[PDB]
Every structure is written in structure tokens, then in C-alpha cells.
Amino acid sequence: AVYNIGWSFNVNGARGKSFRAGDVLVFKYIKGQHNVVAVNGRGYASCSAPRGARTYSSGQDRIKLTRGQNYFICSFPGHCGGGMKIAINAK
Ligand SMILES: [Cu+]
Numbered sequence: 866a867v868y869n870i871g872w873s874f875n876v877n878g879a880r881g882k883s884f885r886a887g888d889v890l891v892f893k894y895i896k897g898q899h900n901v902v903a904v905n906g907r908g909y910a911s912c913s914a915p916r917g918a919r920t921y922s923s924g925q926d927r928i929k930l931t932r933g934q935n936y937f938i939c940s941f942p943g944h945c946g947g948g949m950k951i952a953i954n955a956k
Contacts, residue, residue, distance in 0.1 A: 869893055872901065872939070874947045886932035886955045896924035899939045899949065903928065909936035909952060912945035930955035 866885070871877035872894040892901045901921040908915045920940070921928065928937075932955055939949035 867891060870951075872899055872949070874944065874949055876949065876951055879951050879953060884930060884953050884955045886930060888930045888955060890928050890930065890953070892921065892926045892928065892937075894924050896922065899941060899944065901926050901928070901937055902940045904936050904938055906934065906936060909938060909950060912938060912950065914938065914940055932956070 867889040868882075868884075869878060869891045870893065872892040902914045903919050903921075904914045905918075908918065914920075930953060935953045935955055937951050937953075938945045
């Protein structure tokens with residue numbers, strides 16, 4: 866399935882909803898104001914992207930979920946600490 870995510874300080878579209886491996890998340894926001902970095906668990910916990918992490922910056926980034934945990938954060942200064950981070954469990 867394909868789901869739109871409201872990528873902002875107050876992230877919407879992920880809370881209390883069920884996801885499955887293979888689903889496509891579409892991060893929507895204004896290009897240049899944020900980014901989407903796919904990180905690992907430790908990177909998610911400390912709001913810091915690990916070396917080589919993949920960045921998406923188009924404002925309408927299509928990312929497929931892999932089975933298990935999928936972590937994403939915005940890496941601009943103050944944004945992750947401001948709540949721009951999500952952990953999705955794709956069953
Ligand atoms: Cu951001």
C-alpha cells in the first residue's frame with residue numbers, strides 16, 4: 866500500500882496506524898525546509914545519522930519499508946530534537 870506522511874515538526878499519518886513490509890511511504894513537505902534521513906536504531910535514539918545514511922530531499926520522497934523497524938529523522942539543526950523522527954514497525 867502507499868501512504869502519505871505529513872513531514873513536519875508535528876509528524877502526521879503514522880501514529881496508531883498499522884504498516885506492512887513493502888508499503889511505500891510518501892514524505893510530503895516543502896523542498897528545502899526539511900530532509901528525510903533513513904537511520905538505524907542508535908542513530909534514531911540520539912538524533913544522529915550514521916555514516917553513509919541515505920538522505921531524501923525532494924519534498925515528496927517515496928520510500929519503501931523493509932520488514933521490521935524503519936527509522937527516519939530530519940537532520941537539520943533543532944528538527945530531530947523538535948520531534949521530527951519516526952519509528953515504523955513494518956510487519
Ligand atoms: Cu526538518
